[PDB]
Amino acid sequence: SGFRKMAFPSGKVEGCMVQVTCGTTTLNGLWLDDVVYCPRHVICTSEDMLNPNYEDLLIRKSNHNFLVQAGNVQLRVIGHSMQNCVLKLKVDTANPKTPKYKFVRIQPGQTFSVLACYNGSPSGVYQCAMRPNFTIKGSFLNGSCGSVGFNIDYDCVSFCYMHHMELPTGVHAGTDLEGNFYGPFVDRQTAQAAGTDTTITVNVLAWLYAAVINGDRWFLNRFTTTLNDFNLVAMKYNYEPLTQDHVDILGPLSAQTGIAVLDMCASLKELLQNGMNGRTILGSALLEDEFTPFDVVRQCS
């Protein structure tokens, strides 16, 4: 019993964190085999940030301009290339702590753990989701750029996010490990704003099923709904449309609890209408949307 927001053990990722310095800029790098991946804006100054020509800035750099530090050991950079918004620094030593890994691009609603680092030193681990507006509600300070998001499934680390910027509303934007940004963001200090955020409906439903598995049934009702009627109501609360894929994905939890997805949708409609009336669901007074259907199955039966 118990339901917590849980991050993956960060050990496999900690052994990959390095410090990357270029001039006055110091951020984090991910050292996998003989390559260190980091945000390409490590070559920029604060003035360059408005309209940087990264290819023009990178052509003016040589290997010895990039100082890479793995603990108290400086790594020698023997090459450099840019792949989208990520700089790939070829180093002379392969990381002996390199885990089994892969680079995966996630979709909004998906969750992952963040290992927040400063100066190539991991300082904390937390769990979060890719918001439908492609931002993450992270916890990042100056120097955290290059911190990575990941999932671990049977000894394999799936790297899905690299932190690049903080938007004016306090939310964070970044890329997959191939340097492709999530969302309409650019690595420029130009006027960028996160689009209106929405609640990840499939995740709230998964979390309501986790509440039922943990013995919380107070919010259930005798009603059902059509998928269309659910979405007409959901849209008015800034909830993401529930697709037939979401309904299919919730199938196993529906079978485990004996509550049809469209019956669980009717409970959600009612919760949106009524609020919680001073009650909590899994210790929460708000509807939690940062646990996917797969996280629920993982953590509780």
Ligand X SMILES: O=C(C[C@@]1(C(=O)Nc2cncc3ccccc23)CCOc2ccc(Cl)cc21)N1CCCC[C@@H]1c1cn[nH]c1
Determine the Cα–Cα distance for residues 89 and 271; give it in Å rounded to an integer: 51
Is the CB of 49 or the CB of 67 nearer to ligand X? 49
Catalytic site residue 246? no
Longest dimension (CA), the chain: 69
Is the CB of 10 or the CB of 26 nearer to ligand X? 26
Q: How far is the CB of 123 from a second copy (least distance, A)?
A: 4
Alpha-helix residue ranges (DSSP H) falling in 200-260 = 201-213, 227-236, 244-249, 251-257
Determine the Cα–Cα distance for residues 301 and 286; give it in Å rounded to an integer: 23
Task: Take residue 196 and report the two structure tokens written for it.
Answer: 């209106």
The torsion angles phi and psi of 263, rounded to 5 degrees, stand at -75, -45
Site string for a second copy, 232-271 (x = CB under 8 A): ----------------------------------------
Catalytic site residue 41? yes
Q: Does 30 bind ligand X (CB under 6 A)?
A: no
Instruction: Round the CA-based radius of gyration of the chain to a whole number and report it.
Output: 21
Is the CB of 168 or the CB of 258 nearer to ligand X? 168
Q: Which does 11 bind (CB under 5 to 8 A by kind): a second copy, ligand X, none?
A: a second copy
Q: How far is the CB of 294 from a second copy (least distance, A)?
A: 13
Determine the Cα–Cα distance for residues 252 and 270; give it in Å rounded to an integer: 23
| Location of structure tokens 């753990």 | 113
Task: Take residue 141 and report the two structure tokens written for it.
Answer: 């300070």
* Single residue of 145, 157, 233, 242 touching ligand X by CB under 6 A: 145
Q: 10 Å Cβ neighbour count for 158?
A: 17
Site string for a second copy, 148-187 (x = CB under 8 A): ------------------x---xxx---------------
Determine the Cα–Cα distance for residues 140 and 194; give it in Å rounded to an integer: 17
Q: Does 139 bind a second copy (CB under 8 A)?
A: yes
Residue 40 DSSP code: G
Q: Which does 165 bind (CB under 5 to 8 A by kind): a second copy, ligand X, none?
A: ligand X
* Single residue of 6, 67, 82, 186 touching a second copy by CB under 8 A: 6
Residues 199-238 within binding reach of a second copy (CB under 8 A): 214-215
Contact 52, 25 (CB under 8 A): no
Query: What residues are annotated to the active site?
Result: 41, 145
Binding site for a second copy (CB under 8 A): 1-12, 14-15, 115-119, 121-128, 137-144, 166, 170-172, 214-215, 280, 283-286, 298-301
